[PDB]
Curated annotation (Swiss-Prot):
Changing residue 186 to Y: In a lung neuroendocrine carcinoma sample; somatic mutation. ATP binds at residues 14-22, 37. The active site is at 131 (proton acceptor). Homodimer; homodimerization is important for kinase activation by uncharged tRNAs. Interacts with GCN1; this interaction stimulates EIF2AK4/GCN2 kinase activity and is impaired by IMPACT upon a variety of stress conditions, such as amino acid depletion, UV-C irradiation, proteasome inhibitor treatment and glucose deprivation. Interacts with DNAJC3; this interaction inhibits EIF2AK4/GCN2 kinase activity during endoplasmic reticulum (ER), hypothermic and amino acid-starving stress conditions. Interacts with MAP3K20; activates EIF2AK4/GCN2 kinase activity in response to moderate ribotoxic stress. It is linked to Pulmonary venoocclusive disease 2, autosomal recessive: A disease characterized by widespread fibrous obstruction and intimal thickening of septal veins and preseptal venules, a low diffusing capacity for carbon monoxide, occult alveolar hemorrhage, and nodular ground-glass opacities, septal lines and lymph node enlargement showed by high-resolution computed tomography of the chest. It is frequently associated with pulmonary capillary dilatation and proliferation, and is a rare and devastating cause of pulmonary hypertension. It comes from Homo sapiens (Human). It comes from the Eukaryota. It is found in: Cytoplasm. The histidyl-tRNA synthetase-like region and protein kinase domains are necessary for eIF-2-alpha kinase activity and eIF-2-alpha-mediated translational control. The histidyl-tRNA synthetase-like domain is necessary for binding to uncharged tRNAs. Kinase domain 1 is a degenerate kinase domain. This is eIF-2-alpha kinase GCN2. Belongs to the protein kinase superfamily. Ser/Thr protein kinase family. GCN2 subfamily.
Amino acid sequence: FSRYFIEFEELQLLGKGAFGAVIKVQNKLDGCCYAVKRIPINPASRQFRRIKGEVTLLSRLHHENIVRYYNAWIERHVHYLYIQMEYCEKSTLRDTIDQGLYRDTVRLWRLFREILDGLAYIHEKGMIHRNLKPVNIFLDSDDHVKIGDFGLGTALYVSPEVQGSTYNQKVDLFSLGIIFFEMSYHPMVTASERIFVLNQLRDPTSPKFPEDFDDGEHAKQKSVISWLLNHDPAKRPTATELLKS
Ligand SMILES: C[C@H](NC(=O)[C@@H]1CCCCN1)c1ccc(Nc2ncc3cc(-c4ccncc4)ccc3n2)cc1
């Protein structure tokens, strides 16, 4: 009957929205764990035309810093789209940030370079992420970055050139500037602290780097964050430009 229920054993709900869910499953035949995203779809609609288009791009990605795709299929039970991805054992970049990544200088710079390699690859293949945030970046068991989706305010990652009249591959690099700051800064457990500190970074005049973010031990980071967070997209580097720096 259901391909999902026949082939997989549900282990844990990783994510829940009113309009979608991510489940950790184990495939019965190969004994592997996967993350299976389930999304309700309308096949006689433009929403499904758009979803199928995204599934087409995703199925063509092949890089060590991109969450490995396995399958996608539809079940008529109401139509559901299932996307079977790799299961990343060490959860998301949000979890790393909140557990004090900033103190770990060698790891911090390795993870930023891995997000960069993933990003450069996606741009070289003419694609844009459009939702780059730490919850959408996963870490595997060997502590490697895998860029993913985790999609079920958060507009603090959205580039300024996303308005009526003002957006290419440089949208991802603005979001990257917010992420690298969060990665290079101490955890901001409280919402009010997060919305304040990060809105001060998106200021058109200058990205306000907090008082406890000094040019003593954060000079190399401050340069990269200020360059990526530049209001004028053309003034931002490319991912390869930041890699060959
Ligand atoms: C239960 C735990 N939860 C946490 O750690 C929470 C997370 C939120 C913040 C608080 N901490 C948790 C959650 C996920 C994973 N691993 C994992 N791996 C790969 C994934 C791939 C997709 C994907 C990619 C592309 N297209 C579609 C789906 C979605 C989710 C994935 N999740 C491991 C542990």
